[PDB]
């Protein structure tokens, strides 16, 4: 059994705030399809910053490509020497017309309610 | 001695006299500018003309496929232009950052996206509905409540951008209305001013009468521009209309491509002896021509050598650029469908065909109507890559069945000198000058300086 | 003929060109010329049920069909191919059809056909398929 995937928004994995080797599960607006070196660079938008990650997609295949389209990414991350951050990708579907806030609403909520049930042990 | 031969294709014509009973003939119904003690003639090509075709960086010049068409495409031509308009605007008003559409918040916050209406029916002020872009909010759906809006004036397909307050995320009220920004005008050269003047004249058909092919209004127009010879004459379609009975009937003897070479015939033989140069710009009511907007120019394989340095074929729509001047071209009837489409509540008294003018000079778009007329095809990536206005032009021409008038809007000379034939009696003509002024001063001036509108 | 089939093919082309769109909920039905902005894993979403989505009214199949069944009628010689009995074939040539009657009939394909050379539903772009491919261009 693998380890559980928690949300992470892609400002903060994009800065590197988690420890290597951990399991995350963020989203994303695919960019480019590199496709001899199976590879791909998601953006997604944060006022004036835009961030990018990396995402191996050896695991995946065959796999057909939306351009400029929103995804939801589940995997494991590994600091590389130069790359810096990609993420092994275990399951990457895709999801269209669902608005970002409501989202990160919900994961802001839910992570206040897990804080305020820790605030009694 | 007509040249054409309407009795050889249809011999069951008899011709109307209400056209050969005009009174009025050479009347000036309306001018502008110093059209007062000016000689209204022309050299007949004699002078030096220069022409540049503008738009694209790749004007149009061939044909292209048309029946094929696929949905992302449009969803990625709309979102481009919505995009790049978006953010032309931001740079050019200094905003900072723009809400999501669908963000909950109290503080008022400013939203960029389309306007259009929700109803089938047409566009009225309590039916409208913006809608976002993909790169912000992907296709967003908001209602629009312009209660406290003080003044407006918008329509389908208009690139707005809106600051209004969003509590729920799904009702939001305006508070402030921008306004568009007009491309920057061409800078002439030091060959432009060298120019000093050359004489043009407008045209627009349809050339024949309610029912009668006699075409006496063509030979009277092609007798009138013979003896003016002036330097460059210009005559928009259509050639033949099908609304005519005839061709609805089918009851013509001879084919379609065939009436048209001989009809064009006849122009290039009545033309010979006034010499002067003919550019013949397509529409989309044409018969032996595809209607989708943008089409091809006409094709034509039998021109001499000698007439071929002033016959010219463009696309419709053209930038042509004569003497360092730009002119706006167009066959189709951008006005009455804008009027047709358009909703207002101004404080005051205005021009709305001036309002007109200035939205679509302002929304960088000659047709920035959306969804179009449905009379008419439009295929949207040849659109989008054909047919984007390239500066601010200084001569705007448009041909519509509206009232005829005169206007001129942020520095852009605009003449509708209408339908030359209308019903079974002539229309209205115009003629036009083109002399260049000294551009030593900082304001640039429009080198046109005088207009008449001849009844015919 | 030939004006009344130039007026055919325009209409058919303008009823291709009007964008109609309906709706797949079986219980809405709706039809709308207002093409959304927001798709979805198929395609656009109906801005009325917000659970469906949006098919073409008349589809580039239908048209090309329409073309061909246009481009069939004016085949003499495909028709005279088909004809599995050689005498009868032989028989019926030579008793009515002179060659200025087949002339006729390919001047009536001329004008079919010519709507079809500018036909993009019957032209591949061979860069689009292979492009994934970069090791040797």
Redesign the interface.
């Given at each position: 059994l693998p380890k559980p995937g928690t949300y992470y928004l892609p400002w903060e994995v994009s800065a590197g705030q988690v420890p290597d080797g951990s399991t995350l599960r963020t989203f994303g607006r695919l960019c480019l399809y590199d496709?001899?070196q199976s590879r791909v660079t998601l953006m997604a938008?944060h006022?004036?910053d835009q961030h990018q990650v990396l995402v191996c997609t050896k695991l995946v295949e065959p796999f057909h490509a939306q351009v400029?389209?929103?995804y939801i990414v589940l995997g494991e991350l590994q600091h590389q020497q130069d790359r810096g951050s990609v993420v092994k990708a275990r399951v990457l579907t895709?999801?269209?017309?669902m608005?970002?806030?409501?989202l990160e609403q919900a994961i802001r909520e839910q992570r206040l309610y897990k804080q305020e049930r820790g605030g009694s042990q | 001695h007509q040249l054409l031969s309407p009795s050889s294709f249809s011999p069951s014509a008899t011709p109307s006299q209400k056209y050969n009973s005009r009174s009025n003939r050479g009347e000036v119904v309306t001018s502008f500018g110093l059209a007062q003690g000016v000689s209204w003639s022309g050299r007949g090509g004699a002078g030096n003309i220069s022409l540049k075709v503008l738009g694209c960086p790749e004007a149009l010049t061939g044909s292209y496929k048309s029946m094929f068409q696929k949905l992302p495409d449009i969803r990625?031509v709309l979102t481009c232009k919505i995009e790049e308009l978006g953010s032309e605007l931001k740079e050019h008003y200094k905003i900072e950052?723009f809400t999501?559409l669908?963000?909950?918040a109290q503080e008022p916050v400013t939203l960029l996206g389309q306007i259009g209406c929700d109803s089938n029916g047409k566009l009225n002020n309590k039916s409208v509905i913006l809608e976002g872009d993909?790169?912000?909010?992907?296709?967003?759906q908001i209602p629009v409540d312009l209660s406290e809006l003080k003044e407006y004036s918008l329509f389908p397909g208009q690139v707005v951008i809106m600051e209004g307050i969003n509590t729920t995320?799904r009702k939001l009220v305006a508070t402030k209305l921008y306004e568009g920004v007009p491309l920057p005008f061409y800078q002439p050269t030091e060959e432009d001013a060298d120019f000093e003047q050359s004489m043009v004249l407008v045209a627009c058909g349809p050339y024949t009468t309610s029912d009668s092919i006699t075409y006496d209004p063509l030979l009277d127009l092609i007798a009138v521009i013979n003896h003016d010879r002036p330097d460059v004459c210009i005559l928009f379609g259509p050639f033949l209309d099908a609304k005519h009975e005839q061709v609805e009937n089918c009851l013509l003897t001879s084919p379609f491509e065939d009436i048209f070479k001989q009809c064009l015939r006849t122009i290039i033989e009545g033309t010979r002896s006034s010499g002067s140069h003919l550019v013949f710009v397509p529409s989309l009511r044409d018969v032996h021509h595809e209607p989708v907007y943008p089409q091809p120019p006409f094709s034509y394989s039998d021109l001499s050598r000698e007439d071929k340095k002033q016959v010219q074929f463009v696309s419709e729509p053209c930038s042509l650029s004569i003497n360092g001047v730009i002119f706006g071209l167009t066959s189709t009837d951008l006005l009455f469908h804008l009027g047709a489409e358009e909703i207002s509540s101004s404080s005051g008294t205005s021009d709305r065909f001036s309002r007109i003018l200035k939205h679509i000079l302002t929304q960088r778009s000659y047709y920035p109507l959306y969804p179009p007329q449905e009379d008419m095809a439009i295929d949207y990536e040849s659109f989008y890559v054909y047919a984007q206005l390239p500066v601010t032009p200084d001569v705007l021409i448009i041909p519509s069945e509206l009232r005829y008038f005169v206007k001129d809007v942020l520095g852009c000379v605009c003449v509708n000198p209408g339908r030359l034939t209308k019903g079974q009696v002539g229309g209205t003509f115009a003629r036009l000058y083109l002399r260049r002024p000294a551009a030593d001063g900082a304001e640039r001036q429009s080198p046109c300086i005088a207009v008449q509108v001849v009844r015919i | 003929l030939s004006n009344k089939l130039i007026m055919d093919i325009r209409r058919f082309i303008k009823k291709y060109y009007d964008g109609w769109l309906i709706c797949e909920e079986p219980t809405c039905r709706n039809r709308t010329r207002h093409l959304p902005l927001?798709?979805?894993?198929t395609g656009p979403?109906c801005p009325a049920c917000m659970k469906a989505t949006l098919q073409p009214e008349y589809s580039d199949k239908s048209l090309y069909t329409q073309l061909c069944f246009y481009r069939y009628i004016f085949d003499a010689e495909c028709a005279l191919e088909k004809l599995t009995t050689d005498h009868e074939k032989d028989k019926l040539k030579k008793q009515f059809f002179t060659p200025k009657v087949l002339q006729d009939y390919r001047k009536l394909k001329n004008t079919a056909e010519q709507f079809l050379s500018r036909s993009g539903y019957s032209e591949v772009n061979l860069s689009k398929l292979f492009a994934?491919?970069?090791?040797k261009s």
């Open positions: 496709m001899i938008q006022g004036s400029g389209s929103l895709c999801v269209e017309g608005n970002l806030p409501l | 990625e950052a999501p669908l963000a909950p993909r790169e912000h909010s992907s296709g967003a995320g | 927001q798709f979805s894993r979403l994934g491919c970069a090791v």
